[PDB]
């Protein structure tokens, strides 16, 4: 928990591109985290800040870093419908089949909120469509329960 590391977390969250650029030059800790275990990349992915995700990855940010409940930035990017960030993370070697503590993959989260374009991107980068969570429910089981005709057709 460094001085610059705490400022990078707040900067990445707010989306101040100019401040993040300055903190990367001063050597702010990219692997710094809060109490729940969220990196600047987690926060940047959550609030949908495309530039800061790109800047952090170039400065050796952990793409497959996970919080205290095992959620990676790809989960947050896929769940909250950030198509651009999901592509950038997967290009920089993001684990597409990353399981959290509950066995919920990014495909499950993208399926639940009905983000059709993100499901196609995840499936392209090799998302396990038959991947089950702790309750034994696939991305298809989520689509039929939510009543999504378009999503159910794609997950064939």
Contacts with another protein, residue ranges (CB under 8 A): 3, 6, 14, 34-38, 46, 67-69, 71, 75, 100-102, 104, 133-135
Query: Given the complex with another protein, which of 67 and 87 has the nearer CB atom?
Result: 67
To the nearest whole angstrom, how small is the minimum distance from the Cβ of residue 152 to another protein?
18
Query: Given the complex with another protein, which of 71 and 148 has the nearer CB atom?
Result: 71
To the nearest whole angstrom, how small is the minimum distance from the Cβ of residue 151 to another protein?
19
Query: Given the complex with another protein, which of 6 and 125 has the nearer CB atom?
Result: 6
To the nearest whole angstrom, how small is the minimum distance from the Cβ of residue 67 to another protein?
5
Query: Given the complex with another protein, which of 22 and 36 has the nearer CB atom?
Result: 36
To the nearest whole angstrom, how small is the minimum distance from the Cβ of residue 125 to another protein?
22
Q: Which residues contact residue 75 at a Cβ distance below 8 angstroms, ignoring those fewer than 6 apart?
A: 98, 100, 104, 106, 109
């Amino acid at each position: 928990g460094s001085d610059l590391g705490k400022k990078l977390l707040e900067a990445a969250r707010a989306g101040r591109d100019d401040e993040v650029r300055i903190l990367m030059a001063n050597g702010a800790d990219v692997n710094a985290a809060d109490v729940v275990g969220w990196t600047p990349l987690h926060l940047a992915a959550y609030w949908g800040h495309l530039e800061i995700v790109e800047v952090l990855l170039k400065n050796g940010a952990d793409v497959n870093a996970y919080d205290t409940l095992g959620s990676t930035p790809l989960h947050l990017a896929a769940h909250f419908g950030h198509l651009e960030i999901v592509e950038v993370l997967l290009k920089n070697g993001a684990d597409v089949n990353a399981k959290d503590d509950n066995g919920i993959t990014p495909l499950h989260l993208a399926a639940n909120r009905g983000h059709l374009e993100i499901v196609e991107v995840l499936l392209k980068y090799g998302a396990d469509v038959n991947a089950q969570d702790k309750f034994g429910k696939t991305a298809f089981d989520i689509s039929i329960n939510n009543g999504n005709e378009d999503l159910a057709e794609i997950l064939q």
